[PDB]
Design a binder for this molecule. Structure first.
Ligand SMILES: [Ca+2]
Ligand SMILES: [Ca+2]
Lengths: 191, 330, 191, 377
């Protein structure tokens, strides 16, 4: 176990979202188009700017939801086939003190709050309810990979960062000891 | 402070007549009745009475309402059923008018001049129109819209009004077709739940449930003064009549009144309500006469025309294509 | 907090599962119609019959989802509008050893896992996807409340056992301080 | 005896009272006294390609007695295995350093089947929720079913009555339509849990299907939905594959939780397990001549074996990206029986579905029947 293992920042990891490992279930394997999400992901930063987590898959107009630090405030975005919607939190994320985050999208309607701030809710444009995932989101950042083109200058960051306590769907991620594609081994040099 | 018009001397207008005081402007015709929704019922109350009148009963979740004084109709939305219905104001002959396509049909207004029904859906993020029968249905605005709630019509002025209580908090107006999309107020807003036009006063009033204000603004949104700034824990819907403002408040679960200009004479027209929702003044002068833009004439190109500017513009349903300003075709 | 709870087959608790906080969200009030259910809980009992957990309005045919021990096995039954289904755990529950229960429902499809068994899965009959509910949630069973005509017989036996670590969706439950209708603050005696 | 067994056939006992003959307990025949013939008839074992009589090893209609006067070669071209591989569909000639691709860039191609004498392949994509058709060529793909699916588990082509059936383990139904997908009618609905495999018998107007739901079950119905019956509910957990030996007047099926490939008569009696090993996670079964072919999700391979011995076990393609449904592409794998509808007044009004020994008229979704011949919306 590792109930707290943190990050390098030169560490950029595509964790494993979800599968139907038929092998056990004997269900037919499938990349499920989603409509249900959620978590309780804490955070610490100093960077008033940058990107955090992108869910789904990468290709030109390949469905997504994403989170990024925009102007110090924090906006969650997504597109489903009909134009993308943005959900910005009312929190300066610079603290370096520790902040907890929650965000959820039930089909069209999204939701996101930083801390105890009232839940900012939104809606995807009508005529597209599908999000299209592999069942392995990306996190932290990447190299030469920001796809398609729907990116303000916050979605550019290979964000060297330190967080904690990530959740996917209803099930908790054991941080690194069962990390998916593990880049580095070390907890945070914490404030 | 002279009701409708001065120049030392006061003046009344249209179907009003200066009271034994020569400042006050009483409306002609029948007694104004306050009409409103209750989630479960639709009810009628008399501004200064205990009075109580159950108009429609077995209803699931009735939020927005409006009427057609002539033609004697009453429309209303239902947020769990996701329908917009109408009835014989009689209270009889109830019938489905907008079936598929609804989520949270918040706003609902009737254009008694051009016989059009307009509504907003804050789940759909769009404003829509239609025939009174519920046919000829067409979406109107989808651009930029977040959470539209209240919707007001000026059939005479051929304009439409609304409130958006999404992340960009707005009170907007456009012409009854979708042109001239303007900002009436975008500042010091957060929860603009209500909005009403006082034609005879040539002003618009709205309600902010976060800011605890009933605001008055000229129709261009200039000269914006808050009229009432207290006793507003959570107001939802508003209506003007004569000198008074009527609104529903979810906290006080009640219909409150107060003075248009002063904000004095704050009153609880009715306490102990289930869940006050949309409210209107039911009265002739609330549906003042106005020239049909499509009158003794081409009543809607092929299908339905939309009073834009002056020159009414032609309009095609969802799925249909224009082909001209006389012609509509799928 | 208060961390475990003791049920005598005569203690029935209400909480507030899923509501519309109109007072706070400025959203029009309505019944939450839910696509999804998730909940976890530890349970220890000797009874071989009893209703443990109940989500839904308590009314006639009104959508519900309930967990009851029947004939020494656990089982999940929910009904959405179309006919219900029942998901029978391949597990014996009358062993007075703490057992972890998992139930989840995305639209029509449901599952249930008792301990480390293989999840018994199923679909409710085609036609109904929303659990239509005031957002009431009841622990231990119900008092003079087994609603309408619907249920299998053991759903009237009061619990008679013990619970802890109750999760409702993504929210971990505060047993005592979240109770909305509370009998008595009684912590669980471990044998 | 031992002088009188000088010629007393086989088993002599100059006991009894003075010379009495018998045979070793298989040659049993006793004609007239001193002689002892042979006992066959058949029934018990005797698995020569086709079968014995009074001694016979004759290949059936569409087979030639090969140079071992036992096994048969199917008359027609050399048959191919066609199988769905998820990201595409492929076929392979069994036992060859070859295997050809067919349709490319599919999404999740799970279940397939083919109309031989119409150059047609059908397949169902579980991630697009569609059931498509394409010319056997591999060309002009046409969506044949486009709504109403969740998990299109199985495909079924009645090559004889030109009808396409399928099983949605997401809706728990079995539905039938025209080869173009028209005239869509939901065929079976009740007590269906997780229906997978489907197999047909046009000759007998009969369906067969698996259900690995909570009551796992091999079931059967008359083409039209009437005449339902349990084949097996004993000893099943994951009944994945099902296939008919139309020649062998038998049905072979595969349970991936028991790791068996059992076999039975078309009523289900006389069910022997046939293969009990090398079965980590088989998915789809198929027969032809004397051989069983299956796919396995664990090994990621096409497998095969003797339909009788179970020995002869074999790997065909290894390394398949994820083998699903498999099938023998061969004319005798689709024998032309009598058309129960005949001229298309038999064609009814909408659907002519074979029922019992005759057939019936049936109506697509929406349509009430009037007077058994006719449907109305
Ligand atoms: Ca889409
Ligand atoms: Ca429902």
């Amino acid at each position: 176990a590792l109930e707290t293992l943190a990050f390098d920042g030169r560490t950029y990891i595509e964790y494993l979202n979800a599968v139907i490992e038929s092998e056990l279930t004997n269900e037919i394997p499938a990349e499920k188009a989603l409509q249900s999400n959620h978590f309780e992901l804490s955070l610490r930063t100093e960077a008033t700017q940058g990107l955090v987590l992108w869910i789904g898959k990468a290709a030109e107009r390949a469905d997504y939801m994403a989170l990024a630090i925009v102007d110090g405030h924090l906006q969650l975005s997504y597109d489903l086939g009909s134009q993308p919607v943005v959900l910005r939190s009312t929190v300066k994320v610079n603290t370096n003190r520790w902040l907890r985050i929650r965000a959820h999208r039930e089909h069209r309607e999204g939701s996101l709050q930083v801390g105890n701030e009232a839940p900012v809710t939104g809606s995807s444009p009508l005529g597209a309810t599908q999000l299209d995932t592999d069942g392995a989101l990306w996190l932290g950042g990447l190299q030469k990979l920001p796809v398609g083109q729907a990116l303000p200058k916050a979605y550019g960051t290979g964000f060297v960062g330190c967080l904690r306590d990530v959740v996917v769907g209803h099930r908790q991620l054991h941080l690194l000891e069962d990390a998916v594609t593990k880049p580095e081994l070390r907890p945070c040099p914490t404030p | 402070y002279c009701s409708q018009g001065c120049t030392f001397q006061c003046w009344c207008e249209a179907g009003y007549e200066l009271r034994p005081d020569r400042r006050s402007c009483k409306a002609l015709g029948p007694e104004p009745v306050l009409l409103f929704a209750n989630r479960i019922d639709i009810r009628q109350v008399l501004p200064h009475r205990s009075e109580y009148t159950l108009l429609l009963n077995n209803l699931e979740n009735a939020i927005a309402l409006d009427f057609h004084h002539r033609r004697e109709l009453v429309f209303w939305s239902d947020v769990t059923l996701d329908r917009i219905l109408r009835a014989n104001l009689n209270g009889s002959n109830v019938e489905e008018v907008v079936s598929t396509g609804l989520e949270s049909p918040g706003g609902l207004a009737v254009d008694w001049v051009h016989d059009k029904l307009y509504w907003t859906d804050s789940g759909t993020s769009r404003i829509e129109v239609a025939n009174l029968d519920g046919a000829h249905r067409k979406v109107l605005l989808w651009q930029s819209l977040e959470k539209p709630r209240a919707i007001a019509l000026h059939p005479m002025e051929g304009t439409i009004y609304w409130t958006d209580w999404g992340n960009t908090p707005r009170i907007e107006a456009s012409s009854m077709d979708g042109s001239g999309r303007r900002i009436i107020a975008d500042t010091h807003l957060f929860w603009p739940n209500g909005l009403t036009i006082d034609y005879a006063g040539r002003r618009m009033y709205w309600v902010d449930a976060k800011h605890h204000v009933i605001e008055r603004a000229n129709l261009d949104g200039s000269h914006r003064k808050a009229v009432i700034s207290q006793g507003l824990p959570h107001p939802f819907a508003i209506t003007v009549f004569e000198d008074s403002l009527y609104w529903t408040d979810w906290h006080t679960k009640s219909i409150n009144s107060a003075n248009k200009f002063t904000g004095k004479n704050q009153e609880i027209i009715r306490n102990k309500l289930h869940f006050p929702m949309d409210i209107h003044t039911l009265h002739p002068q609330r549906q003042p006469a106005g020239k049909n833009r499509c009158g003794d004439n081409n009543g809607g190109c092929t299908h339905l025309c939309l009073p834009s500017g002056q020159n009414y513009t032609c309009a095609c349903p969802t799925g249909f294509r224009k082909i001209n300003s006389h012609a509509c075709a799928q």
